[PDB]
């Protein structure tokens, strides 16, 4: 099906395959989720193309481990993923993402600014 | 729709989002759609959406694109032809089709 | 796809590798492909690959090509028409189709 | 044909009187016509005249238009894609189709 953002609470075999491509650093084994520690992913034609981890603390939220697979970049996947995480967590008024682990801060900062975030010391912030 | 390994697009000179014609040797159906990219190296030929009424897995197809140009350039144009066998293993690329002889 | 005697291509102004439409008087099928050259003088009209689902040996067809041009030139354009009988014996060439009268 | 809510025309970049292709996911039919405008906000997709032989109420379709441009601009072209669910509720607009991965 068309590009769709999903909250993953249970992982299929294929989700595990795909998450290992998105995040080779992580064992899908230790991707534990609960109500305040979430995984959102972008699905297209039965495969995950991107994912991000979300930590909720009421009005404050944090993003980590955002990654779109290399092969499908610059086609709006990351933008849609983050738009839907924000839209689906309307109680969060201030979002933060650290700059830890990013492949290229120049690329990441252009993407985060296009998504309405402001570059700050150590990362990017979006408050309403 | 049809998602196609990027390497195959490159070999035939076909662009992502370009109009393509698909001619099915297995069942005779002929249809027109546009090219979606598939991951380089995947060997994928994926007939998607309404187009899936026109093909089955394993069917053998020819995928073509067409361009326009003035008459003078058309007389010396060379098409980008790529030939496949087995499980989408590319055998040869060329720039002409031979003449069929008696 | 369709391989065509080069002399017939020349008479209709059709190029090797040009898009062509094929309209089958015998069975009513209509399809689009491109022109492959066949040896000059062979009289060949060979419907090849997936297109062979659309015709049989002995079928009678019309093979056409289309070009684009500005409106002003279109009003005085003359098509290259070639007429065949029997075993692909060319009877006449012309530059116009008559008016059908009551 | 096909009369289409003006808002949907705008979202896909399709013009009134433009040629369109319609690909029917429900029944597999593929046909070409032109766009008629329907009242903004009506959500109408009305398959009219001879085209009504090709679709029924409730059928799910893809409606596409195609444009021509030089090779260099085609390599960086971004199509106007609009996605619908339910009773023609527009879910998303975008400017690219993702890559299908293995």
């Amino acid at each position: 099906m068309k590009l769709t953002i999903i909250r993953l609470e249970k992982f299929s075999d294929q989700d595990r395959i795909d998450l290992q491509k998105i995040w080779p650093e992580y064992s899908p084994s230790s991707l534990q989720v609960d109500d305040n520690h979430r995984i959102y992913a972008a699905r297209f034609n039965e495969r995950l193309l991107a994912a991000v981890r979300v930590t909720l603390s009421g009005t404050e939220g944090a993003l980590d481990s955002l990654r779109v697979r290399e092969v499908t970049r610059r086609r709006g996947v990351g933008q849609y993923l983050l738009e839907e995480v924000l839209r689906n967590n309307p109680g969060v008024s201030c979002w933060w993402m650290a700059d830890a682990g990013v492949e290229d801060r120049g690329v990441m900062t252009a993407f985060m600014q296009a998504l309405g975030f402001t570059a700050q010391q150590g990362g990017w912030e979006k408050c309403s | 729709x049809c998602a196609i390994d990027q390497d195959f697009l490159d070999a035939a000179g076909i662009l992502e989002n370009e109009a393509i014609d698909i001619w099915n040797v297995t069942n005779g159906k002929r249809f027109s759609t546009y090219a979606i990219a598939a991951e380089r190296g995947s060997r994928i030929i994926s007939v998607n959406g309404a187009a899936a009424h026109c093909a089955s897995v394993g069917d053998i197809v020819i995928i073509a694109s067409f361009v326009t140009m003035p008459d003078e350039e058309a007389r010396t144009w060379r098409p980008n032809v790529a030939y496949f066998e087995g499980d989408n293993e590319m055998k040869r690329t060329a720039k002409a089709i031979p003449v069929q002889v008696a | 796809x369709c391989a065509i005697d080069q002399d017939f291509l020349d008479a209709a102004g059709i190029l090797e590798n040009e898009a062509i439409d094929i309209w089958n008087v015998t069975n009513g099928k209509r399809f689009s492909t491109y022109a492959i050259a066949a040896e000059r003088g062979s009289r060949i009209i060979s419907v090849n690959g997936a297109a062979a689902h659309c015709a049989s040996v002995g079928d009678i067809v019309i093979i056409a090509s289309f070009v684009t041009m500005p409106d002003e030139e279109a009003r005085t354009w003359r098509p290259n028409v070639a007429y065949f009988e029997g075993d692909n014996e060319m009877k006449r060439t012309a530059k116009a189709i008559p008016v059908q009268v009551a | 044909x096909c009369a289409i809510d003006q808002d949907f025309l705008d979202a896909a970049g399709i013009l009134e009187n433009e040629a369109i292709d319609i690909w029917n996911v429900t029944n597999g039919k593929r046909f070409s016509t032109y766009a008629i405008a329907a009242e903004r906000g009506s959500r109408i997709i009305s398959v009219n005249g001879a085209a009504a032989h090709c679709a029924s109420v409730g059928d799910i379709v893809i409606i596409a238009s195609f444009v021509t441009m030089p090779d260099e601009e085609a390599r960086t072209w971004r199509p106007n894609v609009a996605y619908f669910e339910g009773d023609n509720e527009m879910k998303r607009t975008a400017k690219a189709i993702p890559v299908q991965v293995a």
Binding site: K2, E46 | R43, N48, I60, N80 | S65 | -
Partner: peptide, 24 residues
Amino acid sequence: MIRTMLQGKLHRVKVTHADLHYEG
């Protein structure tokens, strides 16, 4: 006078997937 010419082709590729629910 503008002609329509074969730009290129993939000859005898094999369909790997056929799915009505895929985009499309």
